[PDB]
Amino acid sequence: NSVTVRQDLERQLGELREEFNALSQEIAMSQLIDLALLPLDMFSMFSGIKSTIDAAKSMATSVMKKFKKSGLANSVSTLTDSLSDAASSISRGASIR
Amino acid sequence: MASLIYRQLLTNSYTVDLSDEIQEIGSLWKEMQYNRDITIRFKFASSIVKSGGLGYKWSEISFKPANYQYTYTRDGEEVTAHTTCSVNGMNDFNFNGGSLPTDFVISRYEVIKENSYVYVDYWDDSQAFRNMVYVRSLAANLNSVICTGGDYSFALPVGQWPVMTGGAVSLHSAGVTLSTQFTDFVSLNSLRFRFRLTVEEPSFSITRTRVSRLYGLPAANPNNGKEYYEVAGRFSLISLVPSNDDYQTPITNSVTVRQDLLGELREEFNALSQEIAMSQLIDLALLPLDMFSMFSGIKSTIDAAKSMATSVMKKFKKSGLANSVSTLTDSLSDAASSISRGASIRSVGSSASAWTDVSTQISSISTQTSTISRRLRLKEMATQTEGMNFDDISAAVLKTKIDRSTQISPNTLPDIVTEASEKFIPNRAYRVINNDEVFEAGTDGRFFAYRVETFDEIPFDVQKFADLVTDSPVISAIIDFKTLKNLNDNYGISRQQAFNLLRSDPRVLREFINQDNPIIRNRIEQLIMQCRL
């Protein structure tokens, strides 16, 4: 029983980008190419990160709900729609050649 | 890929169970532009139930739904509005001074804290609240309110009065859904928001008792004499008004839909079958059209967008396909386990193999071949194939039809996906290659043995075709021997092109389809016209 347990502010995404730019280049290349041949599925990718949280309330869902709002997913759906339309009957746009 | 989508449906079937659990424990078109403004004036109620005796003890101080009906101004018109406020998920405290009849006791009284949620159904006589029958999206941005509890005295006939005071919580808007208000003759479609509670500084307390520095809001006097609490904001809403040739925009949404009931959906599919092209279809039949990519281009309704994949899955795992798969797996398991008392039904092959156990026979070699070919449909969605994997073409037709077909709905797409998966290319053939000797087979009781380089038939070696199809990878008969030989005769063919057509390679397939080869165009058109529903 308190006034409330506030949730502290997190970052400025500019500064988080600068934290990445501080970890620009010191990745090892043999180890990175050995890491990039692994099916680092949801469990493996969200288990080791920071090793401390009580909630665990489906942060894979929490990142997916922001993943399916972006250019990549919209472009995938656009491509599939274009393929299905063009196949079925749809006229090719004058700009499309 | 296009069969991977069926494999993924079957795999992710396990979510249907928890979805049904949730549902149980819970229980041409156009577009119109809300993002209109609203102001919600509401209030709480209370339900106090006292015990008998001398009058010092209460057995309940609880919350209760509360209606309210008012009027306010918006865009220059006085609109009459109506709210209904209730709560859920509260902490029930109790005070107890002793077991004697004269000791202050509140056996149970409710307090709303950060683990509670309040719901405010809203309605007015505007046009949005009669147009919101088919919604595409809903979300609202409202300011917050701070609701504080007021003074409340317990009517003790003897002695000093306990004074309930303090207590306060902050409602911020988080979550919008639809609901209904049920009148005596008609029903009204309404829009219920959900505010989350955030405790605040004023600590509730019960004077002349050992209760103090207790935060929250109880049900004694939540309004603190205020006639109502008022939030203000905007609600954003998209509609699916079934409009027509591009004029005469409805109002009140002016429609009924197919809920009054497939007889005509089949005719729509049989009208859309042949319009489909072939080169682009083969370009689409190589794409892993996983759940997102298959269910993105559907401009669904607000409920279908939430349950579309699960909706089709809960029917997809009821069908001949799923039951046959489970039957095959049970047969394989019982065969691997029962050997001591081994099921000796039949084995056309070297040894007992569940893929080669003829049964339900209600030519002998023709029967055996058809029966063995009725399980290569399971090989297709068991990933032991090499070619265009006919179910893939079926799924491509499906995804190319359900993006055009006007008649698609939440109750409707389920069992359409399954009728498609079951009745698309019912008869279909397969082949196996071994030392430059192809053994074909088909569910229509036809078999063809033939050499790759020089197409000329051969006696069909059964008990070897089976020994090969059991373990070796399989291929599909898109380019089946009849058309293959017609092609090798008329359109003279090279060794590599013939090997790639045996392997059913999309590159050479689409290259012939662009070279305008009628002996392949006719076959692909036959496959389409069989993918009719």
């Binding site: 409330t4 506030r6 949730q7 502290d8 502010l9 997190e10 970052r11 400025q12 995404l13 500019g14 | 403004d37 941005n141 300011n143 917050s144 309110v145 701070i146 902050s170 911020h172 955030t198 605040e200 203000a232 904001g233 905007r234």
Partner: protein, 259 residues
């Protein structure tokens, strides 16, 4: 589009004496100047003087303004060359710096709906500019779950006051937190504005004390540009004759807009 060139070409003639004939000039002077001068034909006089430098008579405009704040309230500078004369007042330092930050720089401004939405600043140039007769602004930052930090989302008294009875305000807050606001919308309108490249068409001239203007909200640059000029004064006729005589320098320090 791309632009090529060369270093072997020769320098062209002086665009001066043609830009003057095909451009306009607009002085913005305080009422104090007209008062001290106490003449009705000083505008005709100055135009006849400009006519020697080459600026024709129907090219120079004088647009009086009673006070720096009344000018800062929606300054509609529409001319091909603008000059501003600005008195110095320590009590008006931030106001006469915000005026500079507003006119010298070109702003891409969108409107703002406080009562319905909460806003945040993305980059170091997305600021909040409020104009009107008397603005009184208060801000309450929020956390991830829409709760106040040292303030209460409803109780306006707990907000943090950044402006009081200011006719122009330029507000920069921490970039990355969602703020709730309280503004006298009756008397002041507020816009969310991203600072684009500078406005090369206006020239501030500070008539009095030392160089104080800090356009850059960041307290590291404190730059002094080419068209932020200074003069020391005891009369106004001297100021205006100086402007007249050294107008060519001013118009070389200014450059016509691209937009």
């Amino acid at each position: 589009l791309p632009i090529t060139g060369s270093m072997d070409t020769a320098y062209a003639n002086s665009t001066q004496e043609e830009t003057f004939l095909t451009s306009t000039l607009c002085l913005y002077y305080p009422t104090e100047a007209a008062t001290e001068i106490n003449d009705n034909s000083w505008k005709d006089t100055l135009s006849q003087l400009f006519l020697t430098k080459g600026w024709p008579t129907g090219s120079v405009y004088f647009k009086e303004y009673t006070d720096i704040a009344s000018f800062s309230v929606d300054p509609q500078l529409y001319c091909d060359y603008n000059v501003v004369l600005m008195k110095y007042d320590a009590t008006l330092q931030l106001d006469m710096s915000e005026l500079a930050d507003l006119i010298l720089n070109e702003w891409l401004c969108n409107p703002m709906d406080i009562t319905l939405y909460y806003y945040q600043q993305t980059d170091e140039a997305n600021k909040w500019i409020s104009m009107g007769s008397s603005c009184t602004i208060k801000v309450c930052p929020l956390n991830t779950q829409t709760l106040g930090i040292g303030c209460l989302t409803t109780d306006t008294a707990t907000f943090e006051e950044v402006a009081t009875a200011e006719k122009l305000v330029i507000t920069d807050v921490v970039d990355g937190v969602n703020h709730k606001l309280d503004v006298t919308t009756a008397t002041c309108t507020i816009r969310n504005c991203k600072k684009l490249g500078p406005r090369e068409n206006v020239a501030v001239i500070q008539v009095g004390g030392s160089d104080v203007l800090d356009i850059t909200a960041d307290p590291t640059t404190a730059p002094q540009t080419e068209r932020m000029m200074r003069i020391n004064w005891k009369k106004w006729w001297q100021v205006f004759y100086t402007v007249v005589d050294y107008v060519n320098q001013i118009i070389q320090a200014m450059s016509k807009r691209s937009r």
